[PDB]
């Protein structure tokens, strides 16, 4: 009975998601740069890179990818439709506003409701003039902390969840404990935390801090496998195995946050700095290592199939 | 000098004629337009832009310099439609409009990547077209000189040094940020005669204004009709006084008019600055200045020769 729009305006139910990567990207670009300086980009090559990435995940049994690209990081339904068509993978899209500091004057001068309404439109009508609806909302906080504008956008994500019941999938930054501001704001807004992911929690191996989040009842995103600059692979794998052994499995989500294009850094820089980052590292290295430490096949399926499904059905 | 105008034709500075040096055709926020097109109507935007430029045209305006750059919604194709419907020359530029931050794309690559982007626009073309940028914009406002704002100002200066296009600025007089533009341009070796210090008309403080003028730059008395920044009568008195005090060759007049501005609902704009248009200088400013002894030829020096000299030096 829950219906999830997917890139192309089809719908699936949560039961047919199957093996899912809950936080990945197809193309991460900056709208104001791309609009004004198209010569710095190449759409054919972006498309090839996203297709190649998704096909690689698909060879390992991925059926569904949740694209966490929203406004501010270059969301494009038409791009995603080409990717979906070429690959046959389900692509789930969302809404929200991605920022660490400021929001546009457009919404600041109109008030929080204007931002909620834009999100609700994407969820109930469709994204960017299409019939693909947003099936989740994103809230973002980072190293600048809880600025007024960031607070507004997090609260607008919350209010949009209260009106539509779509899950809230977040970005946080663990070094300043911003993860906890998400939870506090969500509690104030009456959000059921079981319908939320506190993101980028896998960027720390501090288990007591992770449990402080877990005891509030939310999902956590162990979601940057392959980005050693946030936390090395060995510590991420160790953390995930330990959290399963301690009884936290129903709250764990795994992903790579992989960006087949990311315009924030030259591609040479990304290759030099995180050469292991792909959309398949979980299947190549993480799962084999977890299996060798006693994690079961069914535990892996609970994480990669049942948890993403339950985020969408409750 | 050859000046590209929207459409990729080129004009020489002599053919600019009566020029509005700081206006807009459409001021919108790229990230919002890209993500929520349902909040916009392109036919209506076009119509408002055309109507505004045709009103100006009625008063003899031949050329409008569109100060819309990256950050506030610049679109060559939109402008080409306006140019073609109206017959008015539209001159475009490049730069990055921000009061605080610049994109990660540029911050992680460094200053040269932003310079090169501007230079691309000036020497090859804007947005895949053959309309080249004819000026570069630099911006500072009430947040002051942040690190990113400083970078973008210095990048505009460096692009000016490579290409010799003029620099038309935005500043905020309330914190004296106008003076940071000046200091930075001097450090970069810019001839200030090739620059406009923008939004100076937002104050009637003669001493502050003369501090800028003695540096040799043009000043933008460029928001006629925005009473919320400064009432029309103070703007008019200030312009008359500056002419009388000998500064005519450094004065530029405009309205900063936005036929669309997505920062505010249209009803709030109508309600707050109902006299804001792209023709108020012709309807009210010029008749008041003439009644105070300002001559016809003085008016032409400000509205014809000054914009020309900005492009020729
Ligand atoms: C030198 C920097 C090396 C490149 C590392 C890549 C950094 C990232 O791309 C992290 C990242 O993805 N942050 C953004 C993009 C996905 O959504 C986010 O929150
Ligand atoms: C509260 C309602 C304010 C109504 C008028 C707002 C007018 C402006 O926003 C002036 C303005 O355009 N400033 C921006 C945009 C043109 O270049 C600028 O720097
Ligand atoms: Co993130
Ligand atoms: Co991400
Ligand atoms: Co301005
Ligand atoms: Co302006």
Numbering used by the authors:
A (entry chain B): 1 to 314
B (entry chain A): 2 to 314
What does the paper say about this structure?
VmoLac (YP_004245953) is a recently identified enzyme that was isolated from the hyperthermophilic crenarchaeon Vulcanisaeta moutnovskia strain 768-2833. The phylogenetic tree that was built from this sequence alignment, indicates that VmoLac belongs to the clade of the PLLs-A. Kinetic characterization indicates that VmoLac is a proficient lactonase with promiscuous, poor esterase and phosphotriesterase activities. As expected, VmoLac is roughly globular and exhibits a (β/α)8 barrel topology that is similar to that of others PLLs such as SsoPox17, SisLac8, DrOPH3, GsP10 and GkL36.
The structure of VmoLac bound to its substrate 3-oxo-C10 AHL enabled us to identify the specific interactions of the enzyme with the bound lactone. Crystals of VmoLac were soaked with 3-oxo-C10 AHL, and the lactone sits in the hydrophobic channel of the active site. The omit density map cannot be confounded with that of the fatty acid, since the bound lactone is shorter, and the lactone ring is visible in the electronic density map. The lactone ring sits on the bi-metallic active site, while the carbonyl oxygen is bound to the β-Co (2.4 Å), and the esteric oxygen contacts the α-Co (2.4 Å). The carbonyl oxygen of the lactone ring also interacts with the Y98 O-H (2.3 Å) and the R224 guanidinium group (3.5 Å). The 1-oxo group weakly interacts with C259 (3.7 Å), and the long aliphatic chain sits in the hydrophobic channel that is formed by loop 8. The overall binding of the 3-oxo-C10 AHL is very similar to the previously observed binding of a lactone mimic, the inhibitor C10 homocysteine lactone in the SsoPox structure. A deeper comparison highlights the fact that the lactone ring is closer to the bi-metallic center in the VmoLac structure compared to the thiolactone ring in SsoPox. Moreover, the difference in the loop 8 conformation between both enzyme yield to a very different binding crevice, where very different residues are involved in the substrate binding, such as Y265VmoLac/T265SsoPox, V274VmoLac/A275SsoPox, T273VmoLac/L274SsoPox, and also V269VmoLac, V270VmoLac, A266SsoPox and Y270SsoPox. This different crevice results in the aliphatic chain binding outside loop 8 in VmoLac, whereas it binds inside loop 8 in SsoPox17. We surmise here that the hydrolysis mechanism of lactones by VmoLac is therefore close to those that have been previously proposed for SsoPox17.
